[PDB]
Paper text:
Phytochromes (phys), first discovered in plants, are red and far-red photoreceptors that are also widely found in bacteria and fungi later. [name] is distinct from other phys and is responsible for the very low fluence response (VLFR) under a broad spectrum of light and for the far-red light high irradiance response (FR-HIR). In higher plants, phys share a conserved domain structure consisting of an N-terminal photosensory module (PSM) followed by two tandem Period/ARNT/Singleminded (PAS) domains, and a C-terminal histidine kinase-related domain (HKRD). Then, we solved cryo-electron microscopy (cryo-EM) structures of apo-[name], [name]-Pr and ZmphyA1-Pr at resolutions of 3.8 Å, 3.0 Å and 3.3 Å, respectively.
However, notable differences were found around the PΦB-binding cradle. Except for those in the GAF helix-α5, the key residues involved in PΦB binding retain similar conformations in apo and Pr states of [name]. Tyr327 of apo-[name] helix-α5 can cause obvious steric clash with the D ring of PΦB. Thus, helix-α5 of [name]-Pr moves outwards, to accommodate the bulk of PΦB and facilitate the formation of covalent thioether linkage between them. Similarly, in [name]-Pr, the PRSSF motif contacts GAF helix-α5 through hydrophobic interaction with its Phe554. Nonetheless, this contact is probably abolished in apo-[name], as a closer location of GAF helix-α5 might cause substantial steric clashes with the PRSSF motif. Thus, the portion downstream of the WGG motif in the PHY tongue of apo-[name] becomes more disordered than that of [name]-Pr, facilitating the entrance of PΦB to its pocket. Size-exclusion chromatography assays demonstrated that PΦB-free [name] (apo-[name]) and Pr conformer of [name] ([name]-Pr) have a similar molecular weight of ~250 kDa.
Author numbering:
A (entry chain A): 75 to 109, 120 to 348, 361 to 535, 556 to 590, 743 to 1041, 1051 to 1119
B (entry chain B): 75 to 110, 120 to 347, 360 to 534, 562 to 590, 743 to 1039, 1052 to 1119
Write the structure that this text describes.
Amino acid sequence: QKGKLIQPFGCLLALDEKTFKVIAYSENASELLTMHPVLGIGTDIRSLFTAPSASALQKALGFGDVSLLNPILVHCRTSAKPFYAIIHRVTGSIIIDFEPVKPYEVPMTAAGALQSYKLAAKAITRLQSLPSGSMERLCDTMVQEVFELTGYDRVMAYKFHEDDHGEVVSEVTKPGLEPYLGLHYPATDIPQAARFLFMKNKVRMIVDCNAKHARVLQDEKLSFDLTLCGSTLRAPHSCHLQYMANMDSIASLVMAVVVNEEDGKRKRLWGLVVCHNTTPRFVPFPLRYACEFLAQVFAIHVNKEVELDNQMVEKNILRTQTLLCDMLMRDAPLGIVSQSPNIMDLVKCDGAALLYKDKIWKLGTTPSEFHLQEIASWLCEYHMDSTGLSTDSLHDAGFPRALSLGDSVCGMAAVRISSKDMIFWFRSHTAGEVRWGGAAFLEVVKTRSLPWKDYEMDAIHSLQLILRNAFKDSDKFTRIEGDYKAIIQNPNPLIPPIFGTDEFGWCTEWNPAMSKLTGLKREEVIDKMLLGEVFGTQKSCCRLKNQEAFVNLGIVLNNAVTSQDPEKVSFAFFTRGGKYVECLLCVSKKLDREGVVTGVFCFLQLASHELQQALHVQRLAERTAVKRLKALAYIKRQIRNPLSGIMFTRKMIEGTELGPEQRRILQTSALCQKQLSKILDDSDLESIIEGCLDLEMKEFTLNEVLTASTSQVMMKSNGKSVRITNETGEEVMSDTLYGDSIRLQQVLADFMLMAVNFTPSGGQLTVSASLRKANLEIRLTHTGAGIPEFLLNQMFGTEEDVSEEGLSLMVSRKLVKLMNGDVQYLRQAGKSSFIITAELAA
Amino acid sequence: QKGKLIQPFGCLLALDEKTFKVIAYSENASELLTMAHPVLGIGTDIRSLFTAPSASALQKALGFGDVSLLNPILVHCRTSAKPFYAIIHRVTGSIIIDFEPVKPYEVPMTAAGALQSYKLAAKAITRLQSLPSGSMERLCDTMVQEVFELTGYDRVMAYKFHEDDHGEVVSEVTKPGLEPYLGLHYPATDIPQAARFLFMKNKVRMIVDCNAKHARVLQDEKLSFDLTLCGSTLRAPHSCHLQYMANMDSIASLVMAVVVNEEDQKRKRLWGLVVCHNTTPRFVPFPLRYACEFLAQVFAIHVNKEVELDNQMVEKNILRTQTLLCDMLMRDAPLGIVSQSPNIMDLVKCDGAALLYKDKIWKLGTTPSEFHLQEIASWLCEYHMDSTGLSTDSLHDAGFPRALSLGDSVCGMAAVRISSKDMIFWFRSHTAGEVRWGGKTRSLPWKDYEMDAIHSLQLILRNAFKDSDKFTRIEGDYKAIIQNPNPLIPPIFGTDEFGWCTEWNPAMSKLTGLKREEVIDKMLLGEVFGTQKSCCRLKNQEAFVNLGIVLNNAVTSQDPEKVSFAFFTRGGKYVECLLCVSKKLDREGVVTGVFCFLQLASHELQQALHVQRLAERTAVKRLKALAYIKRQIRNPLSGIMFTRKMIEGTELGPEQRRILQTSALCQKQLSKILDDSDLESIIEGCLDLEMKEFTLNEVLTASTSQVMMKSNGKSVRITNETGEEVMSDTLYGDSIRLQQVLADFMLMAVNFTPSGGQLTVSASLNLEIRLTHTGAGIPEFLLNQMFGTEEDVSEEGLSLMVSRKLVKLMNGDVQYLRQAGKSSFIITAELAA
């Protein structure tokens, strides 16, 4: 922080807060500024520059927060050399850094901050337009935009893990360089001092490494040593220089990403965005400022997308709760595997087994009954005081016959239902490969399975509890997964609140979870009418807020009596003492064995507010989507009807004898109607955009296509008085082609109709076709300026969304791509040419 | 309320709260319950006239806490069978038990409690719940239709109370052959306030027969207080309802009550009644009455919801007026607003705009003559000295000397003075007003926020001119009710290109608590709006970054955008609103900063737009796919049109010409149906119809050509038997939509028909078209879908619903008639010949 060496592309001056006189100066500063006022201790600052520059600098030092006006434009007194001045406040002193102003780009008058921030107005918009839910897309977009703005050769999205070991997540380099994606790096490349330094100043630049750095002339009479930690000209340290030495890079630009995560707010370094170049380069301060702002935006976005993945766990927990509630109705024996929701959906796995009275059931990939007997015997004999176990890899646990099992089963999770009854879940082997570069060593994770999370064990234990209670009517788990001997622990049940009533309305079920959630003892509440006594506005144990809640509860119960499916509704009630519980009620029928309705069975689902709002938004979106789909189907039918009408009328007209030229005109109309029926037959363009398509195989000739297109277009062409000519040879005509004719006619007609529309009044258009032995090349040459550049760019498929005409162009290009061809646009003096390539069978 | 007379269809008993002995009774009880026994006298026990389980149930009910839960207690008499309901009420110092006979023709023990009783109305509640919001008349008509279907009474009416207690019939449903009173107002004296309070206390009242003889109640003389039968369901009318029934020609009555909770606990007001009248005596079981009482609660909830939605719509409208009141400071000179398209005609709802400025008169829309405007200004400057504005909806009543000569084209005038010579007029048009009572143009009166908007426009224009209070008396039949409208100018702050503050209007000073002098000449980011050492403290980093982003985007982009904003003021109050930004382009065309204003929005409205925007962001491709399809429609249509032209380009015969013209008719049909989607055409004003000459022969031929294909597919023959006299006659009206309607009607007739069936077409001229097809006929549930009874509609039924609504737009109805092997579709409409 006190290294007295600075880079030579700029100069530094350290002054006092009160005297405004130069104390610390650099050797190159005297040369650059005086290129006469001798730069030295006790010299003023105004005389080195002109009067307006001195006034601006003095006002800047007089400001409260100089960081808002950091890039200042100043002029040297002699020859008016432009310079960028940056002000920074060290304890008891002001440090100003001056850099030369190359032509480059200049903001309006003084750059300030907002104008500099304006330089990154496109990358911010592109980042804010991405659909949420995919961190990799965000990383790729940020890296690409940083590459575009900075212009450095290589851009990397180095990421920090919990053990501070790096992992590149993306990279975009110029062609002709070694990719670095996926290469892990050790924790000694970046010392913790570097991270601490980056936590303070977010952007660091090293313009060149093999350059002689000047020194400073810090005053001897100063009572404190100057700190160069905050200055942007501080010379790189040897340890940091070793990084570029091992990375064969010269110019570096490192931008920290700082997120704010709530205390378990505390700051955290999500990673870095590193830029490298093989040759030295320098960029103006506004570009660095804009890059820092863009990094702030990216940090905000990543912090937002972490919270969205924090909700998938809650959603899966709710789904498991629903499954557990559903499974409570089935009979204890064989009811575990009776219907579609078996114990495969309880925890993610590929094999399940239920040992009960020597009747081993199989549900998938699982060892033989012999091997299952052996593993059950081993678990019984070794782990006496273990109701349940979860082994990551059976080899590590110590199963003698784990070798004979093979690679099919690796992880195991077993529970003891009763003295002789047990349940097993098995997981197949997954191998992990980590490049682990910058070290390269290639570590192996041996034969291990995916870890068993907490809520999976919680669900398994809840299932065990349910089965034990059901069997009775008719707790420490050893987790040897980290090869750290026994880490036995106690899980928690995952039973949601439940209450059930008979047909009349008297309470009959009140489980301990509800007793804890409400605070009401079951003995206190049972044998009381559900509507009016347990839940009621006045004179009731649990006080509903309004009369609307009472009406809604009554409606929900009455509707649920009729319908078997469990409707999800909102619920809100006060507890015994002044607490407003807001949950999501689910009611289901209670059909008995014979099939007589006995009552209702209800359970709540406690959920955070964001999840409920997301569910509401999803419901609204699906309703809007179904309405739009119904409207589109209605329109399609109402257009299909007159389509059939005109088909039949054309058939009737063809029934009467007419001229051979009339016959040709009728045939051209027939091709037009077939094209119309085909385009109306398409369900939507989204399937075309996705890529899933089929092209029919049929015989055709070019005369039909050309005549259909000309008949389609020439009315509009003559609207602008446009001449159309055909130069295709008759030999190419006589040749017959094979493929999908309708797509070709529609695509070529659209392209050449756009050419007609772009044709100025009185222009000329020529159509030619060439057959090479087969390949067909189509040239459409129209007189005029042609399509503008932006529309030509919109024609390409790189853009996600374009104009309607641009969308038609993109769809035609995609169809040509599926037609193993290409589309080219050529501009010449007063001419524009479309070239279309196709490959078919002759 | 203390009347000792009861209706004869039930019986009454009274029990002491503690001793549980009978103290009052009725002769109907003597003739109905103990008939074949203990004497029904004072002090007689209760557990002797019923079976032991019945006595146990009665004892348990009496010992219960809240008896009003399990009211319809079915009880078996001591004699064999003879069921009876046992409704119970707790009155001061007694418990009153009413028995009503259970007729076994219906309801064989289908309800024994409140929860089971409420089940009978599940279908009605489901139908009411899923209706789209924003239409009171639809809710009322559905509600009364459901009442009619559930109860089966002859006449059902929704009777809405106004502020002056005088009622208005909003809807009504009756069996055919009955005189309607729809829309007829009634005096407030028909229903006394005592009846209103009684309805507020007892939600449902039933009078089975007005002519039935009432029976007395024998009560002990030893009690110190008389028994009150006000809460009992067995009470006799006190001649107040007898006269009402005689006047309305009714014999039986079932009258409910609608109670709505309105904010100042919130008060409860009787929004109206749902009255059922019958010409013959009728009896409904207690569960049906109990369910009809439950339906009223859902109806009241929905009515309150619709009222809140209307209030939010009003707030959105005033927000829009506030937004459009801006963009007039930017425009230079008074002529600038007149020249531009969003003119002063859009500031307030008017049919004519006039501006008098320096001997120049600028007029827009329906406006009087120049001499008329000059004489209006002369009158206003000659009779009104100190006024800054005038307002009236009837200029004739205003006292204009030549108001009658001005005609009915313009009636209401609102005028505001800008300078000593320049001033502004807003004029309205003719409105139709009819009021009925069961016992020169008037235009809608000017509201208050309209006056506020006009006053703020006056302030803006006078400020701009300088840079270069007023009485309404027509809302009532009075004179010179002076008012002082307040302005509607939103808070405004504006900065230059560097970021320093430049303009900070007083509204922002009031809202945020700061002052103009202490904030001016400071950077907008960091100094004013900042997380630290700032006047207005932002919440966290995200707000700062978002504000910077929106400022930069506003500078770069060209259109205003709305972004949520939230900050702490200097007094600790958390303000949340919407921020709108715009570029402050100079006359030359170079940006010189930004101009921003806040739109303080209500919490419900603000949160009703976040979810809307979030849902909008989900659908992107499908929104523009419709426009893409609409634009790409033209090319195949142009191709088919030009192919038709070339087909015409040679020699043709008579039949060939006819079939070509039929094809062309279908061609225009396809063109105009693909040109516009028309959405649902819910409003009759929308979907303007082309009206041109046509003949019926072409229409019929074009309609049957589209379906001959399917007819020959099933080998179904179609015959047209309309006479040549009707065919030769020419009508002036819409044709092609009639072609489509006829075509899809015969298409549906072909569907669901056996092969070899006969289809017959007839027309009578009022145009009536009858299409009779032989076979089994269309299934009933399809007709239920097409009539709108079933909310869920199939794709095939949607076309029939569209055709029915189109026929209704032609002021007609579609009729389905069923006979042995015959189904007849009758379409009726009118045109000009």
